[PDB]
Amino acid sequence: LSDDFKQISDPKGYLTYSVKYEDQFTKKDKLRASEADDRIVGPTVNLFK
Amino acid sequence: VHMTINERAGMSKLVADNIIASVIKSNWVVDILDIEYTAEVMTPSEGYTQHVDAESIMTAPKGKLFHLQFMDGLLRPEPSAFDPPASGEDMRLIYPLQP
Amino acid sequence: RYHESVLEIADIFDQADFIQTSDAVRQLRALMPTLSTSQIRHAIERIAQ
Amino acid sequence: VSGLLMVLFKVMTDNRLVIVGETTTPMSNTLSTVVNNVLRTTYHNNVGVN
Amino acid sequence: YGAAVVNIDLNRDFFDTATGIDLTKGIPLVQDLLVPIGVTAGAEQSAEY
């Protein structure tokens, strides 16, 4: 009787971190831990590298 | 220092290489409790078919089974009386923690 | 000051008919990763397979 | 000002309704304890950032 | 004469690969029983024990 809701799967928030790095001290290479711990921790350690 | 490492995860390559260098240079004794492995006891004549860098012992996934090898040198016959003297010193790093 | 340890049900019940196991199975279960119900289904489907 | 309005509006109309997405359920022994204390069994593959 | 070591292993001829049990590492291992869900298990997992 109504199409009241969209049905997204992996919702986007209203806010996000944005990060400026200092190029001189940053390493371009992606950080690599154990595969599982990277599946969880990984997007974070790469953002606050 | 008898250093004990319960969980390798998150350890830097620099820190690890430095711990190893401390084992060699400062005679550190570094137990690493997180390693699960399956030992194979070799006889002296079959040598060590499968090798292991210190780097891999430090940086292997927490869940994976390592496969170490360990010699039983009980059946190694004595050197001939006139074999040239060995100035070099054979050295070792990895040992089991349990029988 | 306590000592934790297993106690087989056989050591308390004199009624042997309702005793099918021992310390062994608990000791085995200690080795097992904690299992989401979905993993339990995967295991059963595998043993079936 | 208009910015805020359409932010507010876009919030006033977020009729999104979450449904479980792809979700890994890691074997517990493969995770470092600092992660294991945090995990509740399963997480979305799109972990995001914290 | 000259046998350096005499171990007692599980009989691989009995605990066959028809049961899915490898024994080459000296312990039983099974490919896909206790496994992560939503990803590939990964090689040489200890859970296989």
Side-chain angles (χ1 to χ4, degrees):
Chain A
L1 300 176
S2 62
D3 198 323
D4 223 27
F5 297 122
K6 286 185 70 278
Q7 297 180 64
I8 46 90
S9 283
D10 293 87
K12 294 167 302 199
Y14 301 151
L15 296 164
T16 54
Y17 298 104
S18 85
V19 182
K20 275 203 177 70
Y21 314 94
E22 202 265 0
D23 300 330
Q24 184 195 352
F25 298 115
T26 224
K27 218 85 163 187
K28 235 51 171 292
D29 46 44
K30 177 171 277 72
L31 272 58
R32 305 301 288 265
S34 164
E35 183 61 33
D37 308 26
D38 174 85
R39 286 190 189 98
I40 292 141
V41 129
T44 293
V45 288
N46 283 306
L47 189 68
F48 311 118
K49 53 169 61 272
Chain B
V1 166
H2 176 199
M3 167 154 312
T4 310
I5 298 178
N6 309 277
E7 188 64 25
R8 275 133 47 232
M11 185 180 309
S12 175
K13 191 177 195 310
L14 291 160
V15 161
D17 291 24
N18 180 267
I19 288 169
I20 296 305
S22 302
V23 171
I24 309 185
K25 289 302 193 59
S26 295
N27 304 80
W28 272 20
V29 178
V30 176
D31 296 39
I32 306 170
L33 306 192
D34 20 339
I35 298 297
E36 314 224 38
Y37 62 94
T38 63
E40 186 175 7
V41 186
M42 312 265 76
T43 66
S45 28
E46 60 189 337
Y48 289 101
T49 72
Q50 186 261 11
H51 297 294
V52 267
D53 303 30
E55 188 68 27
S56 70
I57 220 74
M58 280 292 201
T59 70
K62 189 256 191 60
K64 151 151 307 182
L65 257 174
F66 241 117
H67 172 71
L68 303 187
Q69 294 182 343
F70 301 97
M71 188 57 65
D72 166 33
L74 217 284
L75 258 68
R76 179 182 297 104
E78 273 179 2
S80 94
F82 303 101
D83 258 90
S87 56
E89 203 63 30
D90 301 320
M91 288 282 184
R92 198 179 157 188
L93 277 76
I94 336 185
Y95 304 78
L97 240 2
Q98 67 202 48
Chain C
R1 212 197 159 182
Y2 61 83
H3 178 225
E4 202 174 13
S5 66
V6 245
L7 172 74
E8 297 183 4
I9 298 293
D11 299 330
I12 44 180
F13 278 86
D14 300 330
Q15 259 282 5
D17 297 29
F18 319 111
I19 290 161
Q20 350 283 359
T21 41
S22 56
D23 177 28
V25 46
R26 143 122 20 196
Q27 164 188 351
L28 202 164
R29 180 179 65 132
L31 295 180
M32 214 147 325
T34 307
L35 293 176
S36 87
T37 74
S38 199
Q39 296 181 317
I40 293 171
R41 153 163 274 100
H42 199 294
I44 277 139
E45 287 182 359
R46 172 78 158 122
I47 300 179
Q49 167 186 124
Chain D
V1 178
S2 66
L4 303 182
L5 286 188
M6 291 299 295
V7 148
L8 182 56
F9 189 83
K10 193 63 190 311
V11 167
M12 182 215 237
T13 335
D14 201 40
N15 62 337
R16 287 183 299 158
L17 175 77
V18 225
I19 302 183
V20 187
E22 292 185 3
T23 39
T24 138
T25 304
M27 231 75 167
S28 76
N29 56 322
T30 53
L31 291 179
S32 43
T33 67
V34 64
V35 157
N36 237 79
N37 294 333
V38 159
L39 232 287
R40 283 93 118 101
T41 321
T42 144
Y43 58 101
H44 280 62
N45 295 35
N46 191 22
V47 254
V49 161
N50 200 284
Chain E
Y1 195 95
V5 249
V6 179
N7 299 19
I8 305 166
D9 310 36
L10 277 325
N11 182 336
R12 78 168 51 105
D13 293 24
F14 171 78
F15 292 107
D16 44 340
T17 53
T19 323
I21 315 177
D22 63 87
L23 273 171
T24 47
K25 291 293 212 79
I27 50 178
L29 300 174
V30 180
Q31 291 304 317
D32 224 272
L33 199 65
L34 317 184
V35 63
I37 295 193
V39 277
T40 56
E44 302 181 0
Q45 234 280 3
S46 90
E48 290 180 358
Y49 169 80

